[PDB]
């Protein structure tokens, strides 16, 4: 079967800057490759068909190139609505369709530091029999960030869940919220609680003690 | 990028395809390839595999030679790629009937099939070529002599052998491409990307002389689009002239077939007046009879400028040129106790040359001389034969005193000719002399009064004299004055 | 205009089957091929199967063989899908896409979410995240915990507070219930002055909870 | 005067089907008369023959489905140049 390899996985660029995405076919596919754009909460949108032709209602900044195995999608000047996921697609025999892995286009801003916060379990939550400690990481540009929970100078075994927001429309930053969940018994018999953030520091833990 | 097979590639022309059924909805060939009502096969995507690929090799939008060429498909091969000679004849009759109905234009018939030698099939190819049709056939994939196969052995067709990415003849197990004197040239025939009948945008890699013949039919369609009044004789000479030279290692071919097999790989170079185009034709082996005769003729619209002979043992009695049907023929003679000889002719495009033979009988004095004396005549070749069992100024042929000398005198005021020689006192196996740049070799011979000469033959613009006083290779080089 | 209307989304019990539809309009339904493509959140496009509304000819992905079935009804221009013995890995947004033979996917469906879980409908428990006594900008929020299914809409001060608000995507925990958090960053001077309330709405259970965030 | 032709590659031979090729100047009416004469002489001897196709435009002649026993009879027919036994062709 044909395998479509896309490079890179994530493309971080600034608005106005030129973007180039590569799709590589494992076999000769001629010029019968299609490009799709997928914005969040939406279905993929036909962008480039037959490796070079713009689809109906596609702005002129989008251009495709290639024939055979190497294909390129080019955006002349990045508009803020162009930051999405891009897919290359071909037809085949054994599986009748082949999609690429996908390439996410990200807005690039100056390296910002996260405003780290900590939140103790609520008073009403302690009566329920479960404790939840929250570590906030607010407005930071590089999505890559690590959170290591410090339960009285010990590690976080396997009781931590986190989620990251989508890139902000105003300042192009990300935000993280990690939740350390514990039982009512395990929360009481421990002194100090902290969350260590290794982003662009060095290491900045924020602690709390009841 | 561009597949390797298209590296040497730089209007009312129809390409008829006699193959299996084709998938006409394929993106590579749709709109350009028409499916005729013709079907004659001996009894769904495997049925279309062979024909679809070849249509894609000729007129494929991405992987074709003649990108966007008009094609017409006839079904003569079943789902297993098997057909009959009788079914093929009816297909060829369908083209002759279609040629009289459809508007006048260049017709290319692609025959990517092979059976054994067929008298009726070669006679059918002769009939169409006489009507102005350019027939391109496959040499076969039997690692054999293509003269034993039809329509490969038909003198009026363009027989195509197959070569790989390294310009080496295709090998497929115990088999591979066919070879011999019946082959015109070679073309890419291994790992050829083309249209796949599995999906409308799929590509598949296939190999064979069928892919090689489809490559040459693509080149011929591009030649006929630019110059629609090209004859088959003019088109064959150009394919030979445009071909890559000496790029095939002949060691792949059997020893007795190395001299017979052309070392030409198809190409279409950048386009860039009248120039002299010559080619070599080889006759069939004469046989062990002491009075056996090998005869080499040229194709219609071509002129015979010289005649030479060759014997693997060297037991021969030379050659001669003679008028037969208003044209010169090359006739070689076998000696008493000889295995047989080859008659080797030099076939050129020299219109209204009206070449004549001028013979001097053996003078038996100190030797035999003859020259071209007519107004606007040039010497193109020297031939010599002797009736004995064992022998003992420019614009002139010189032979042995016991031998009869022959001169080919062609009326060509636009040609200037010269003689070029090279002699070796103790030759290992061969004596070689080549024409200079811009010159065309018209004649290849050896000087008489020599010990042991096997024969002489022209390989492109090089005169090759085979050996076992200095043995001298004599080359007659002609060119246009402009 | 060409429209592709999907239907049949929601909750499926593990071991159960999803049953989707795709109603087509604006064209000759038999002239084009139809596909069923799914997409897990964060992951790429995974094709399920194909059908030819003219012939009835079908193709399926090897990973779904025996589980997936695609059928059609040309009289009502509707495409059908059935995927049996579902596991939690089958939670994805399902699309029906029209193909122009040998060209591209020109039209798509709106996208239908199918969630596979054995959990029951449950309203959330809103717990506040109080601003710290220790330390120009103060951060506070509220924890929306133990609800099923998705989604939960969170607003601050009935929509009067939009700046610096970060409502985080929820996480599926061990119990099979969801948990999210919505945080706002406010200046430290307006703590005792301005009152902060988070407005939680869980539409599947008709649960509307207002909770005031007050320093400890 | 008429000669017989067949495939030298014995596995590719197709006996039972023959291409009867007539002389160069033969008219279509003479081709149909020869095919009718062949059927008359064979049915008189107890053979059931079938004319599959009649050639005109490319080559004068016809395609016959008959027993190999009738070759000596068919080669003696007037206007006959040669008869060729059908054989297989293959995709290369
Ligand atoms: C290379 C060429 C094309 C070509 O050059 N075509 C020509 N047409 C006329 C002259 S050359 N390719 C297609 C196939 C093919 C087949 C050839 O032998 C088939 C013959 C039949 C007669 C007995 C010897 O085997 C052949 O060589 C011949 C052909 C005829 C005579 C001749 O005596 O008329 C002859 F002396 C030598 C050359 C080719």
Using the Cβ of C179 and the Cβ atoms of chain A, whether some distance falls under 8 Å is answered with yes
For domain C119-215, the question of CATH label 2.60.40.10 is answered with yes
For residues B3 and B124, membership in a common domain is answered with: yes
For residues B222 and B282, membership in a common domain is answered with: no
**Alpha-carbon B352 to chain mean position:** 22
Contact A29 B201 (CB under 8 A): yes
CA–CA separation, B459 and B264 (whole Å): 11
Which tokens sit at A112?
């910002």
Q: Is A208 helix (H, G, I), strand (E, B) or coil?
A: strand
Which tokens sit at B58?
């000729």
**Which residue carries 């069928």 as its tokens?**
B210
Contact C105 A91 (CB under 8 A): no
Mention every residue, 6+ apart, whose C-beta is less than 8 A from residue B31.
none
Note whether C146 and C127 are within 8 A (CB): no
Mention every residue, 6+ apart, whose C-beta is less than 8 A from residue A158.
none
Q: Is D4 helix (H, G, I), strand (E, B) or coil?
A: strand
Enclosing H/E stretch for A186: helix A184-188
Q: Which of B21, B24, B49, B50 is catalytic?
A: B50
**DSSP alpha helix (H) spans, chain C:** none
Angle at A154 between CA A152 and CA A155, to 5 degrees: 130
CA–CA separation, A43 and C111 (whole Å): 6
- Out of B238, B273, B308, a domain closes at B273
CA–CA separation, B175 and B225 (whole Å): 36
CATH of the domain at B325: 2.60.120.690
Q: CB of B281 closer than 6 A to ligand 1?
A: yes
Domains held by chain A: number: 2
Which tokens sit at A40?
């969040």
Q: From its phi and psi, is residue B369 left (phi > 0), alpha (psi between -120 and 50) or beta?
A: beta
Q: CB of B216 closer than 6 A to ligand 1?
A: no
Using the Cβ of C45 and the Cβ atoms of chain A, whether some distance falls under 8 Å is answered with yes
Total Cβ atoms within 10 A of residue A207: 12
Q: Which residues of C touch B31 (CB under 8 A)?
A: none
**Alpha-carbon D43 to chain mean position:** 16
Q: Where are the domains of chain C?
A: 1-118, 119-215
Which tokens sit at B212?
């090689």
Q: CB of B268 closer than 6 A to ligand 1?
A: no
Chain B interface disruption, residue of C102, C104, C105, most B CBs within 10 A: C102
Strand B14-19 to B107-111 pairing? parallel
Q: Is D72 helix (H, G, I), strand (E, B) or coil?
A: helix
CA–CA separation, B38 and B97 (whole Å): 12
Total Cβ atoms within 10 A of residue A42: 12
Q: CB of B75 closer than 6 A to ligand 1?
A: no
> Which of B 13-42 lie inside 8 A of C, CB atoms?
25-27
**DSSP alpha helix (H) spans, chain D:** 28-43, 71-74
For residue B53, the distance in angstroms to the closest alpha carbon of chain A comes to 14
Residue D10 Cα to ligand 1 middle (Å): 25
Which tokens sit at B476?
């007659």
Mention every residue, 6+ apart, whose C-beta is less than 8 A from residue C212.
C128, C195, C196, C197
Report DSSP letters for C14-55, one per residue: TT--EEEEEEEESS-GGGSEEEEEEE-TTS-EEEEEEE-TTT
- Out of A90, A109, A128, a domain closes at A109
Residue B205's alpha-carbon distances to A124, B52, B166, B181, in angstroms, are: 71, 12, 17, 29
Q: Is C189 helix (H, G, I), strand (E, B) or coil?
A: helix
Which tokens sit at B148?
């034993």
**Number of helices followed by number of strands (H, E) in chain A:** 2, 18
For residues A150 and A184, membership in a common domain is answered with: yes
Greatest Cα-to-Cα distance within chain C, rounded to the nearest angstrom: 72
Note whether B154 and B191 are within 8 A (CB): no
Q: Which residues of A touch B62 (CB under 8 A)?
A: 30-32, 67
Domain that holds residue A53: 1-109
Phi, psi for C66 (deg, rounded to 5) = 95, -25
CA quadruple C78, C83, C89, C91: dihedral sign: positive
CA–CA separation, B426 and B411 (whole Å): 38
Q: Beta strands of C1-149 (E only): which ranges?
A: 3-7, 10-12, 18-25, 33-39, 45-51, 58-60, 68-73, 78-83, 92-100, 104-108, 112-116, 125-129, 137-147
CA quadruple B115, B118, B124, B130: dihedral sign: positive
- Percent of residues in chain A assigned helix, strand, coil, to nearest 5: 5, 50, 45
CA–CA separation, B447 and B431 (whole Å): 11
Total Cβ atoms within 10 A of residue B437: 7
Nearest to B464 by CA among B332, B324, B280: B280
User: Neighbouring chains of C at 3+ CB pairs within 8 Å?
Assistant: A, B
DSSP, res D12? G
Question: Is B191 a residue of the active site?
Answer: no
- Out of A109, A136, A164, a domain closes at A109
Residue B469's alpha-carbon distances to A198, B264, B429, B433, in angstroms, are: 94, 35, 15, 17
Q: From its phi and psi, is residue B220 left (phi > 0), alpha (psi between -120 and 50) or beta?
A: alpha
DSSP, res A100? -
DSSP, res C161? B
Mention every residue, 6+ apart, whose C-beta is less than 8 A from residue C213.
C128, C129, C130, C131, C140, C141, C142, C196, C197, C198
Total Cβ atoms within 10 A of residue A202: 6
Which tokens sit at A90?
């071909």
**Alpha-carbon B76 to chain mean position:** 26
Note whether C22 and C77 are within 8 A (CB): no
CA–CA separation, C49 and C51 (whole Å): 7
Label each residue of D41-57 as H, E or C: HHHCCCCCCEEEEEECC
Burial B200-236 (b: 16+ CB within 10 A, else e): bbbbbebbbbbbbbbbbbbbbbbbbeeeeebebbebb
CA–CA separation, B408 and B410 (whole Å): 6
Experimental approach taken: X-ray
Angle at C133 between CA C130 and CA C136, to 5 degrees: 95
Of D5, D63, D87, the CB nearest to B115: D87
Ligand 1: which atom is nearest the Cα of residue B146? 14
DSSP, res C190? G
Which tokens sit at B171?
């090998």
Which tokens sit at C132?
């710290």
Residue B407's alpha-carbon distances to A72, B472, B478, C216, in angstroms, are: 66, 19, 15, 122
Note whether C165 and C184 are within 8 A (CB): yes
CA–CA separation, B289 and B293 (whole Å): 9
Label each residue of chain B as H, E or C: CCCHHHCCECCCCEEEEEECCCCCCCCCCCCCEEEEEEECCCCCCCCCHHHHHHHHHHHCCCCCCCCCCEEEEEECCCCCCEEEHHHHHHHHHHHHHHHHHCCCCCEEEEECEEEECCHHHHHHHHHHHCCCCEEEEECCCCCCEHHHEECCCCCCCEEEEEECCCCCECEECCEECCECCCCCEEEECCCEEEECCCCCCCEEEECCHHHHHHHHHHHHHHHHHHCCCCCHHHHHHHHHHHCEECCCCHHHCCHHHCCCCCCEECCECCCCCCCCEEEEEECCCCCCCCCCEEEECCCCCCEEEEEEEECCCCCEEEEEEEECCCCEEEEEEECCCCCCCEEEEEEEECCCCCCEEEEECCCCCCCEEEECCCCCEEEEEEEEECCCCCCCCCCEEEECCCCEEEEEEEECCCEEEEEEEEEECCCCCEEEEECCCCCEEEEEEECCCCCCEEEEEEECCEEEEEECCCEEEEEEEEEECC
Using the Cβ of B89 and the Cβ atoms of chain D, whether some distance falls under 8 Å is answered with yes
Note whether A86 and A73 are within 8 A (CB): yes
For residues A100 and A114, membership in a common domain is answered with: no
Nearest to B234 by CA among B149, B299, B293: B299
Q: Which of B140, B155, B330 to mutate to test the pocket of ligand 1 (most atoms within 8 A of CB)?
A: B155
Contact B82 D59 (CB under 8 A): no
CA–CA separation, B112 and B19 (whole Å): 7
For residues A72 and A2, membership in a common domain is answered with: yes
Total Cβ atoms within 10 A of residue B399: 27
Total Cβ atoms within 10 A of residue B161: 35
Q: Which residues of C touch A41 (CB under 8 A)?
A: 111
Note whether C50 and C70 are within 8 A (CB): yes
Q: Which residues of C touch B200 (CB under 8 A)?
A: 101-102
CA–CA separation, B39 and B161 (whole Å): 27
Total Cβ atoms within 10 A of residue C206: 9
**Alpha-carbon C172 to chain mean position:** 13
CA atoms within 13 A on the CB side of A17: 13
Contact A28 B202 (CB under 8 A): no
**Euclidean distance between the first and final Cα of chain C, in Å?**
59
Q: CB of B298 closer than 6 A to ligand 1?
A: yes
Which tokens sit at B42?
């001996």
Strand B107-111 to B134-138 pairing? parallel
Residue D7's alpha-carbon distances to B18, B91, B118, B136, B370, in angstroms, are: 21, 20, 7, 22, 48
CATH of the domain at B36: 3.40.50.200
- Out of A109, A129, A162, a domain closes at A109
For residues A92 and A43, membership in a common domain is answered with: yes
CA–CA separation, C186 and C213 (whole Å): 12
10 Å CB burial of residue A68 (0-12, 13-18, 19+) is buried
Query: For chain D, after which residues does the C atom lie more than 2.5 Å from the next written residue's N, i.e. where is it broken?
Result: none
**Alpha-carbon B258 to chain mean position:** 15
Contact B1 A31 (CB under 8 A): no
For residue D10, give the chain B residue with the closest CA. B116
Which tokens sit at B281?
């034709």
Count how many residues are written for chain C. Answer: 216
Q: At what angle do helices B209-226 and B49-59 cross, to 10 degrees?
A: 30
For residue C135, give the chain A residue with the closest CA. A117
Chain B interface disruption, residue of A1, A30, A49, most B CBs within 10 A: A30
Nearest to B14 by CA among B101, B90, B109, B94: B109
CA–CA separation, B209 and A125 (whole Å): 81
CA–CA separation, D6 and B150 (whole Å): 12
Note whether A196 and A147 are within 8 A (CB): yes
Note whether B114 and B152 are within 8 A (CB): yes
CA–CA separation, A44 and C105 (whole Å): 9
Note whether B89 and B100 are within 8 A (CB): no
Bond preceding residue B443 cis, omega within 30 of 0: no
For residue C104, give the chain B residue with the closest CA. B201
Count how many residues are written for chain D. Answer: 92
Domains held by chain B: number: 2
Burial B2-22 (b: 16+ CB within 10 A, else e): ebebbebbeeebbbbbbbbbb
Count how many residues are written for chain A. Answer: 210
Note whether B330 and B381 are within 8 A (CB): no
Note whether A41 and A136 are within 8 A (CB): no
**Beta partners for B138?**
B160
CA–CA separation, A26 and B211 (whole Å): 23
Burial A177-199 (b: 16+ CB within 10 A, else e): bbbbbbeeeebeeeeebbbbbeb
Using the Cβ of A125 and the Cβ atoms of chain C, whether some distance falls under 8 Å is answered with yes
**Which residue carries 């005109």 as its tokens?**
D56
Which tokens sit at B36?
């005729």
Which tokens sit at C88?
């939690």
Residue D33's alpha-carbon distances to B89, B384, D22, D38, in angstroms, are: 21, 53, 12, 9
Contact A90 B201 (CB under 8 A): yes
Total Cβ atoms within 10 A of residue B379: 26
Residue C19 Cα to ligand 1 middle (Å): 71
A interface with B, Cβ–Cβ < 8 A, is 27-32, 67-70, 90-93, 96
Using the Cβ of A41 and the Cβ atoms of chain C, whether some distance falls under 8 Å is answered with yes
Nearest to A71 by CA among A31, A11, A12: A31
Which tokens sit at B398?
């010189």
**Which residue carries 């107890």 as its tokens?**
D46
Mention every residue, 6+ apart, whose C-beta is less than 8 A from residue A81.
A39
> Strands of A70-75's sheet, edge to edge?
A4-7, A19-25, A70-75, A62-66
Using the Cβ of D59 and the Cβ atoms of chain B, whether some distance falls under 8 Å is answered with yes
Question: Is B460 a residue of the active site?
Answer: no
Note whether B446 and B472 are within 8 A (CB): yes
CA–CA separation, D11 and C96 (whole Å): 55
Contact B83 D89 (CB under 8 A): yes
Q: Is C88 helix (H, G, I), strand (E, B) or coil?
A: helix
Note whether B24 and B73 are within 8 A (CB): yes
Which tokens sit at D36?
């009718």
Chain B interface disruption, residue of A28, A51, A98, most B CBs within 10 A: A28
- Out of B273, B308, B325, a domain closes at B273
Phi, psi for B368 (deg, rounded to 5) = -95, 120
Domain that holds residue B58: 1-273
Q: CB of B155 closer than 6 A to ligand 1?
A: yes
Chains D and C: 3 or more CB pairs within 8 Å of each other? no
Q: CB of B297 closer than 6 A to ligand 1?
A: yes
**Alpha-carbon A54 to chain mean position:** 27
**Number of helices followed by number of strands (H, E) in chain D:** 2, 5
Residue B95 Cα to ligand 1 middle (Å): 24
Mention every residue, 6+ apart, whose C-beta is less than 8 A from residue A93.
B196, B198, B199, B202
Q: CB of B154 closer than 6 A to ligand 1?
A: yes
Nearest to B223 by CA among B69, B111, B19: B69
């Amino acid at each position: 079967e044909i395998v479509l390899t896309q490079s890179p996985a994530t493309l971080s660029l600034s608005p106005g800057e030129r973007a180039t995405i590569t799709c590589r076919a494992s076999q000769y596919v001629g010029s019968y490759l299609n490009w799709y754009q997928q914005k969040p909460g939406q279905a993929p949108r036909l962008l480039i068909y037959d490796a070079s032709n713009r689809a109906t209602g596609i702005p002129a900044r989008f251009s495709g190139s290639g024939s055979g195995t190497d294909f390129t999608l080019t955006i002349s000047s990045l508009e803020p609505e162009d930051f999405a996921v891009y897919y290359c697609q071909v037809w085949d025999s054994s599986p009748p369709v082949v999609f690429g892995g996908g390439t996410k286009v990200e807005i690039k801003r100056t390296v910002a530091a996260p405003s780290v916060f900590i939140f103790p379990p609520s008073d009403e939550q302690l009566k329920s029999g479960t404790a939840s400690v929250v570590c906030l990481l607010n407005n930071f540009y590089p999505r890559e960030a690590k959170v290591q929970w410090k339960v009285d100078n010990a590690l976080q075994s396997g009781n931590s869940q986190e989620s990251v927001t989508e890139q902000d429309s105003k300042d192009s930053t990300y935000s993280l919220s990690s939740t350390l969940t514990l039982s009512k018994a395990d929360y009481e018999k421990h002194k100090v609680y902290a969350c260590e953030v290794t982003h662009q520091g060095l290491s900045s833990p924020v602690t709390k003690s009841f | 990028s561009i597949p390797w097979n298209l590296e040497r590639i730089t209007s009312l022309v129809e390409v008829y395809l006699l193959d299996t059924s084709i998938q006409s909805d394929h993106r590579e060939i749709e709109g350009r390839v028409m499916v005729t009502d013709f079907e004659n096969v001996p009894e769904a995507s495997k049925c279309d595999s062979h024909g679809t690929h070849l249509a894609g090799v000729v007129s494929g939008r991405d992987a074709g030679v003649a990108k966007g060429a008009s094609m017409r498909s006839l079904r003569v091969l079943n789902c297993q790629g098997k057909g009959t000679v009788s079914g093929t004849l009816i297909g060829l009759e369908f083209i002759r009937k279609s040629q009289l109905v459809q508007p006048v234009g260049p017709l290319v018939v692609l025959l990517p099939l092979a059976g054994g030698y067929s008298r009726v099939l070669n006679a059918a190819c002769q009939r169409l070529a006489r009507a102005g049709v350019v027939l391109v056939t496959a040499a076969g994939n039997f690692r054999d002599d293509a003269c034993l196969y039809s329509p490969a052995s038909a003198p009026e067709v363009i027989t195509v052998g197959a070569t790989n990415a390294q310009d080496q003849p295709v090998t497929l197990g115990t088999l591979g491409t066919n070879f011999g004197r019946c082959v015109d040239l070679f073309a890419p025939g291994e790992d050829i990307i083309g249209a796949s009948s599995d999906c409308s945008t799929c590509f598949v890699s296939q190999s064979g002389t069928s892919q090689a013949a489809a490559h040459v039919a693509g080149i011929a369609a591009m030649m006929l689009s630019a110059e629609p009044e090209l004859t088959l004789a003019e088109l064959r000479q150009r394919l030979i002239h445009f071909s890559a030279k000496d790029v095939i290692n002949e060691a792949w071919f059997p020893e007795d077939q190395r001299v017979l097999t052309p070392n030409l790989v198809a190409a279409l170079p950048p386009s860039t007046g009248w120039q002299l185009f010559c080619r070599t034709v080889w006759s069939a082996h004469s046989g062990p009879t002491r009075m056996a005769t090998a005869i080499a003729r040229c194709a219609p619209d071509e002129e015979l400028l010289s005649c030479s002979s060759f014997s693997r043992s060297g037991k021969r009695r030379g050659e001669r040129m003679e008028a037969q049907g208003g044209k010169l023929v090359c006739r070689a003679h076998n000696a008493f106790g000889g295995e047989g000889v080859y008659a080797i002719a030099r076939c050129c495009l020299l219109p209204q040359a009206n070449c004549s033979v001028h013979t001097a009988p053996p003078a038996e004095a100190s030797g035999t001389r003859v020259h071209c004396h007519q107004q606007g005549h040039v010497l193109t070749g020297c031939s010599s034969h002797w009736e004995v069992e064992d022998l003992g100024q420019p614009n002139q042929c010189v032979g042995h005193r016991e031998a009869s000398i022959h001169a080919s005198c062609c009326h060509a005021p636009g040609l200037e000719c010269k003689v070029k020689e090279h002699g070796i006192p103790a030759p290992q196996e061969q004596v070689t002399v080549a024409c200079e740049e811009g010159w065309t070799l018209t004649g290849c011979s050896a000087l008489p009064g020599t010990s042991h000469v096997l024969g002489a033959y022209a390989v492109d613009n090089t005169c090759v004299v085979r050996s076992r006083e200095a043995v001298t290779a004599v080359a007659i080089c002609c060119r246009s004055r402009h | 205009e060409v429209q592709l209307l999907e239907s049949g989304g929601g909750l499926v019990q593990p071991g159960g089957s999803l049953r989707l539809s795709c109603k087509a309009s604006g064209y000759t339904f038999s002239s084009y091929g139809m596909y069923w493509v799914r997409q897990a959140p964060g992951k790429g496009l995974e094709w399920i199967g194909w059908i030819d509304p003219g012939s009835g000819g079908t193709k399926y992905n090897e990973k779904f063989k025996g589980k997936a079935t695609i059928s059609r009804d040309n009289s009502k221009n509707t495409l059908y899908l059935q995927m049996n013995s579902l596991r939690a890995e089958d939670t994805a947004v399902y699309y029906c896409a029209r193909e122009r033979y040998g060209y591209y996917f020109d039209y798509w469906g709106q996208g239908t979410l199918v969630t596979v879980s054995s959990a029951s409908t449950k309203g959330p428990s809103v717990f506040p995240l109080a601003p710290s006594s220790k330390s120009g900008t103060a951060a506070l929020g509220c924890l929306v915990k133990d609800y099923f299914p998705e989604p939960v809409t969170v607003s601050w001060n009935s929509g009067a507070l939009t700046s610096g608000v970060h409502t985080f995507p929820a996480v599926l925990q061990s119990s099979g219930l969801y948990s999210l958090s919505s945080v706002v960053t406010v200046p430290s001077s307006s703590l005792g002055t301005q009152t902060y309330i988070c407005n939680v709405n869980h539409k599947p259970s008709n649960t509307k909870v207002d909770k005031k965030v007050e320093p400890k």
